[PDB]
Amino acid sequence: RKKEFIMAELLQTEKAYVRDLHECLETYLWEMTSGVEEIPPGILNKEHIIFGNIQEIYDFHNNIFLKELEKYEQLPEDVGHCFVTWADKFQMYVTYCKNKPDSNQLILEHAGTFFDEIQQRHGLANSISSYLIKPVQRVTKYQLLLKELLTCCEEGKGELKDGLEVMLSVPKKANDAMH
Amino acid sequence: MQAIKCVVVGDGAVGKTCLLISYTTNAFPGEYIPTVFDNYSANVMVDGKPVNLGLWDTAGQEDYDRLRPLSYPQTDVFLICFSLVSPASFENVRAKWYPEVRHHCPNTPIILVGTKLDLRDDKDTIEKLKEKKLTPITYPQGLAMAKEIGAVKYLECSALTQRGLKTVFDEAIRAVL
């Protein structure tokens, strides 16, 4: 039962993560690139600093990783292999984390209330800052879920240790890349 | 209506995720303890005034010292947590959590929170600590640590029984107002 609860949480929180990134792209980003309204000169043409590579992270989870995780729903003991297969894609969280301080400083010093207004306009519970920390939270969460699976899978569980090794290597590399 | 960002920090042993789940759902999760608490906001009423309380978890970041501060800017109040039956987690308040919170947020208020209150009297817990020449953390130790780090309150609570739990978050809001 316990490994079934863990697999269910993995899948349900992955759908929530894809939804969250999709909302962030189609609200805060879409207002900047649309040309519908007014971009202060301090953030004009600087969407790439504010949002980093969160588009490419979204594309990976929406096009590939959620669909492949769903294929492991009845195979929780083997799901470590999913992270092995797709380990190279997780390198873009290193790029994302490196850029995060520059993004936060730009928003504070030069965005004013531009994004607060968009948030009130759309009725969003989450500020742009709440969305932009989610890739940092998610990439440090996978290792916790894999650790939990190891407490309740047998010893055909070498297909968890190898995936856990990947998902400890990735956030450590991102950590070591910060200034 | 005022919005409040509250960030919860401390060792893995404190039960950060379980604490937040039990507070926001008014029930200990019991059967299975989830690992994920996504950023949360609710309207809560304190001293006859509506407040939008935002809560961020940090579980999973305990070993990444340069990733953790990415959550810290523009925080209105911090909960620095330790488990009352883990002396190692209590000492890390002084060694680990207070130093980085103060360095990044020198003017933000702190509440010191001792968790797992229900275990302080548990015979099995006490005995396993005794085998390592330790004992649970008692109220005056928490008072002395709170004074040392400049916390505006020290509070004890249990996610299991919900004793003291709502008070923790009520007082976090009052520290900002």
Curated annotation (Swiss-Prot), chain A:
Limits of the DH domain: 2-177
Tissue: Isoform 2 is brain specific. Highly expressed in cerebral cortex, putamen, amygdala, hippocampus and caudate nucleus. Weakly expressed in brain stem and cerebellum. Isoform 4 is expressed in skeletal muscle.
PTM comment: Autophosphorylated.
Localization in the cell: Cytoplasm; Cytoplasm, Cytoskeleton
Entry's free-text remark on domains: The two GEF domains catalyze nucleotide exchange for RAC1 and RhoA which are bound by DH1 and DH2 respectively. The two GEF domains appear to play differing roles in neuronal development and axonal outgrowth. SH3 1 binds to the first GEF domain inhibiting GEF activity only when in the presence of a PXXP peptide, suggesting that the SH3 domain/peptide interaction mediates binding to GEF1. CRK1 SH3 domain binds to and inhibits GEF1 activity.
Function noted in UniProt: Promotes the exchange of GDP by GTP. Activates specific Rho GTPase family members, thereby inducing various signaling mechanisms that regulate neuronal shape, growth, and plasticity, through their effects on the actin cytoskeleton. Induces lamellipodia independent of its GEF activity.
Subunit: Interacts with the C-terminal of peptidylglycine alpha-amidating monooxygenase (PAM) and with the huntingtin-associated protein 1 (HAP1). Interacts with FASLG.
Family assignment from sequence similarity: Belongs to the protein kinase superfamily. CAMK Ser/Thr protein kinase family.
Misc remark: Called DUO because the encoded protein is closely related to but shorter than TRIO.
Protein name: Kalirin
Organism: Homo sapiens (Human)
Taxonomy of the source species: Eukaryota, Metazoa, Chordata, Craniata, Vertebrata
Encoding gene (name): KALRN
Segment of the intact protein contained: 1280 to 1458 of 2986
From Swiss-Prot, chain B:
Modification sites for Phosphoserine: S71
Tissue expression as described in the entry: Isoform B is predominantly identified in skin and epithelial tissues from the intestinal tract. Its expression is elevated in colorectal tumors at various stages of neoplastic progression, as compared to their respective adjacent tissues.
Short motif (Effector region): ranges: 32-40
Resulting phenotype, K166R: Loss of FBXL19-induced polyubiquitination
Membrane-protein topology: Lipid-anchor
SUPFAM superfamilies: P-loop containing nucleoside triphosphate hydrolases
Cross-linked sites for Glycyl lysine isopeptide (Lys-Gly) (interchain with G-Cter in ubiquitin): K147, K166
A single GO BP: cell migration
EC number(s) given by UniProt: 3.6.5.2
Keyword annotations from UniProtKB, A to Z: Cell membrane, Cell projection, Cytoplasm, Disease variant, Glycoprotein, GTP-binding, Hydrolase, Intellectual disability, Isopeptide bond, Lipoprotein, Membrane, Methylation, Nucleotide-binding, Nucleus, Palmitate, Phosphoprotein, Prenylation, Synapse, Ubl conjugation
Free-text activity regulation comment from the record: Regulated by guanine nucleotide exchange factors (GEFs) which promote the exchange of bound GDP for free GTP, GTPase activating proteins (GAPs) which increase the GTP hydrolysis activity, and GDP dissociation inhibitors which inhibit the dissociation of the nucleotide from the GTPase. GTP hydrolysis is stimulated by ARHGAP30.
Gene: RAC1
Tree of life domain: Eukaryota
Glycosylation sites: Y32, T35
UniProt-recorded name of the protein: Ras-related C3 botulinum toxin substrate 1
Family: Belongs to the small GTPase superfamily. Rho family.
GO cellular component, one term: trans-Golgi network
Subcellular location: Cell membrane; Melanosome; Cytoplasm; Cell projection, Lamellipodium
Protein's job: Plasma membrane-associated small GTPase which cycles between active GTP-bound and inactive GDP-bound states. In its active state, binds to a variety of effector proteins to regulate cellular responses such as secretory processes, phagocytosis of apoptotic cells, epithelial cell polarization, neurons adhesion, migration and differentiation, and growth-factor induced formation of membrane ruffles. Rac1 p21/rho GDI heterodimer is the active component of the cytosolic factor sigma 1, which is involved in stimulation of the NADPH oxidase activity in macrophages.
Listed result of changing L67A: Strongly reduced interaction with PLCB2
Oligomer status and interactors: Interacts with NISCH. Interacts with PIP5K1A. Interacts with the GTP-bound form of RAB7A. Interacts with SRGAP2. Interacts with CYFIP1/SRA-1. Interacts with PLXNB3. Interacts with ARHGDIA; the interaction is induced by SEMA5A, mediated through PLXNB3 and inactivates and stabilizes RAC1. Interacts (GTP-bound form preferentially) with PKN2 (via the REM repeats); the interaction stimulates autophosphorylation and phosphorylation of PKN2. Interacts with the GEF proteins PREX1, RASGRF2, FARP1, FARP2, DOCK1, DOCK2 and DOCK7, which promote the exchange between GDP and GTP, and therefore activate it.
